[PDB]
Design a protein around this ligand. Structure first.
Ligand code: ZN
Lengths: 161, 98, 301, 99, 100
């Protein structure tokens, strides 16, 4: 039985840490002591932590800490580092996309009249949105242009609440 | 080198240092001790409030000198307000009573 | 940045009597704040006196009251410095009014001590850790009650060493009651930020900004605090938020007095960066360099 | 591409506005599409001009709403943002739309 | 028109503003072919119960200056007579005498 553990890497080199970890496994051929390696990603939590299905021998512990650009495990102590849980894995299995679901297929940011456009033509700008076309994913934000609140069809992702 | 009134530093409103930067000579700590050692009290007050730090004090001083007045409105050093903001930016609550 | 460290609405307009973005270019309506600008309308030196506050997600105890030798929280909660730091850096648990169990109030707990206790005293039992637990301890510390006890303890003993150890603890216990200082004010909950004007961002001769060290410190505390708020939104597991709150604790402790904790942080290149307490202390602080000795106009050499 | 719909009652004013917009575009960015005149809306109205009765007595008014379609092919950093500053003549409803 | 008439109109408008959500809902219910008969009946009865002035088909468009019911224009909110005056004065933007 292989239980999960948390590894800390230099944040930013995480995919390269995951690749080097798989390669160190297939070098030192402790293939029966490693199951997977997770870096989850949303359309990126967790910011700098690598999840490893593993068992705990001191040889495999030295293996994971001899993988380059890895600081160490995160647990209660450094003698016997800590696995995480299992009761919160059943609820996480039913839902694995809480920060990008179809629960609210419309408003991604409170409309009202306070928003800023940056991914559209007029970048680094803010305006008041009277009406909105959520159905067709459109916004009528009236930006201040030539001393006038002129509206402009902007994208939900293009603007920022 | 000589300086009547030149540029002023940004974080603490005191004159700049050096010659290439048109600056004023450092009235250091031992000179403050040597003026405490006499009875010179107004000389030290204008030497570290009017001539150096207090911005409204030194504009009042410049108007008073070019009008013949010869008088100082003291005020507070602005760098002491910087000390209050740096101690206050910790968890410490420094104030000014009364 | 709206609204970042160097904000408009939180502090003031860069230009004197001007909305930085665009309205009021004369001297009539000094104060109006349109929605397009989210900016106040006052003087250029108004930002030097105005200060901001960072809502620290996780409580962080002050380093000046935890490592002053003797620590302010060390001789007040009757706990050794070593044990205080252990719990503070998410390496030890602390009990707080457990209940009907066989455990003290000051006595700490380890992973093994908690695990067994967790399966034992699953009901009425409280054993937190970090500044949060520490705060509670201080918060729930009847000052007056301790006075009499300490005073009675000093009059019911003859131990020389103990006498001096008891007189130094009761002195700081009755002094806190004499003033309006609370025991829960030791832990920082609403970290204050120094005025931008006092942490100036000027470019040198060229096209880049030579940034101060305090902007690195505040920007790291805010980066970590945003990460910790997002993880408490997402319900990350225990070890993730313990490392996250521990990194926030070390970030706050590095902002206030850098290097009093283990080896000081550094930006460029290996030299440590200068914190607030290092703007106060030393030969080049504010006392010895700008308040006792000043540079002086009408002077020559 | 940024489509811009200028609408106004006075034609001269509209023209002036359009030119200004073009100028604003052309200095910052490059390849302004051009000021394309769409059809004018001549919304007419008839009314009886007597207070009481005389039905053949009538005034026929109209409001000529003019349209100008200006398009900008390359939205740069500098160009799109510029619009905010350059203020045009009053009584000209503009309507910018990126994409 | 009288003051009284104007007041009445205003009241009607207010009522309309108030009761729109409910009334609309009721109407929808009544329409909905995929619904119970009893429910429909209730809805119909419910509608009756609501005030009459709550209906939008009750309120007459009057001139915003004079309250004259007839000769109205929607674009201007004014009766013909007043509209003409406005036009003459320059008070309606864009409006001028048309010939073709
Ligand atoms: Zn403004």
């Amino acid at each position: 039985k292989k239980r999960w553990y948390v590894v800390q890497a230099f944040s930013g080199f995480e995919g390269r840490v995951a690749t080097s970890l798989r390669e160190h496994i297939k070098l030192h051929n402790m293939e029966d002591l490693f199951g997977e390696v997770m870096v989850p990603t949303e359309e990126k939590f967790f910011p700098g932590y690598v999840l490893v299905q593993m068992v705990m021998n001191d040889a495999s512990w030295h293996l994971v800490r001899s993988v380059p650009r890895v600081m160490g495990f995160i647990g209660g102590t450094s003698d016997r580092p800590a696995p995480i849980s299992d009761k919160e894995v059943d609820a996480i299995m039913n839902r694995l996309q809480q920060v990008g679901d179809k629960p609210r297929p419309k408003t991604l940011f409170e409309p009202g009249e306070m928003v800023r456009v940056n991914d559209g033509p007029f970048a680094d700008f803010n305006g008041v949105v009277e009406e909105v076309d959520y159905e067709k994913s459109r916004l009528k934000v009236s930006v201040s242009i030539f001393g006038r609140a002129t509206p402009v069809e902007l994208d939900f992702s293009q603007v920022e609440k | 080198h000589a300086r009547s009134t030149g540029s002023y530093s940004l974080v603490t409103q005191q004159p700049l240092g050096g010659k290439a930067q048109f600056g004023g000579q450092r009235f250091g700590e031992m000179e403050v001790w040597a003026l405490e050692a006499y009875g010179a009290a107004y000389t030290l007050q204008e030497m570290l409030t009017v001539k150096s730090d207090d911005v409204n004090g030194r504009t009042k001083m410049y108007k008073n000198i070019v009008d013949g007045n010869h008088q100082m409105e003291p005020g507070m050093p602005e760098s002491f307000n910087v000390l209050l903001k740096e101690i206050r930016s910790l968890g410490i609550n420094i104030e000014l009573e009364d | 940045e709206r609204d970042g460290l160097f904000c408009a609405r939180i502090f003031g307009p860069v230009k004197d009597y001007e909305c930085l973005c665009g309205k009021y270019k004369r001297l009539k309506h000094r104060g109006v704040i349109c929605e397009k600008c989210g900016v106040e309308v006052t003087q250029t030196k108004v930002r030097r006196e105005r200060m901001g506050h960072i809502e620290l997600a996780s409580p962080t105890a002050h380093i000046w009251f935890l490592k002053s030798l003797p620590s302010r929280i060390g001789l007040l909660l009757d706990m050794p410095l070593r044990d205080i730091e252990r719990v503070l850096y998410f390496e030890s648990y602390v009990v707080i009014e457990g209940g009907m169990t066989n455990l003290e109030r000051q006595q700490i707990l380890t992973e093994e001590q908690y695990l067994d206790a967790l399966e034992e005293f699953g009901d009425e039992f409280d054993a937190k850790m970090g500044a949060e637990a520490i705060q509670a301890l201080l918060k729930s510390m009847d000052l007056e009650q301790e006075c009499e006890q300490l005073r009675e303890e000093l009059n019911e003993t003859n131990s020389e060493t103990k006498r001096k150890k008891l007189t130094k603890r009761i002195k700081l216990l009755e002094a806190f009651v004499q003033s309006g200082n609370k025991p829960e004010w030791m832990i920082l909950t609403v970290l204050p930020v120094l005025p931008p004007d006092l942490r100036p961002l000027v470019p040198l001769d060229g096209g880049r900004f030579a940034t101060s060290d305090l902007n690195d410190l505040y920007r790291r505390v805010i980066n970590r605090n945003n990460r910790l708020k997002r993880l408490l939104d997402l319900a990350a597991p225990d070890i993730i938020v313990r490392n996250e709150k521990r990194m926030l604790q070390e970030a706050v402790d590095a902002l206030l007095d850098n290097g009093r904790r283990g080896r000081a942080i550094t930006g460029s290149n290996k030299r440590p960066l200068k914190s607030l307490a290092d703007m106060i202390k030393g030969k080049q602080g504010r006392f010895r360099q700008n308040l006792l000795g000043k540079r002086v106009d009408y002077s020559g050499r | 591409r940024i489509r811009i719909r200028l609408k106004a009652f006075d034609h001269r004013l509209i023209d002036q506005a359009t030119a200004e917009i073009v100028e604003t575009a052309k200095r910052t960015g490059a390849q302004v599409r051009g000021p394309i005149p769409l059809p004018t809306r001549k919304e007419r109205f008839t009314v009886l001009i007597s207070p009481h009765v005389n039905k053949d007595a009538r005034d026929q008014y109209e409001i000529r709403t003019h349209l100008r379609l200006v398009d900008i092919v390359e939205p740069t950093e500098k160009t799109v943002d510029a619009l905010m500053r350059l203020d045009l003549a009053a009584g000209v409803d503009v309507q910018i739309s990126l994409g | 028109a009288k003051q009284s008439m104007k007041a009445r109109e205003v009241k009607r408008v207010a009522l309309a503003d108030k009761y729109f959500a409910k009334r609309a809902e009721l109407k929808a219910i009544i329409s909905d072919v995929n619904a119970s008969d009893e429910d429909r009946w209730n809805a119909v009865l419910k509608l009756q119960t609501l005030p009459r002035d709550s209906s939008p088909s009750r309120q007459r468009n009057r001139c915003r200056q004079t309250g004259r019911p007839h000769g109205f224009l929607r674009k201007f909110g004014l009766s013909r007579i007043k509209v003409r005056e406005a036009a003459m004065r320059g008070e309606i933007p864009g409006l001028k005498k048309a010939s073709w």
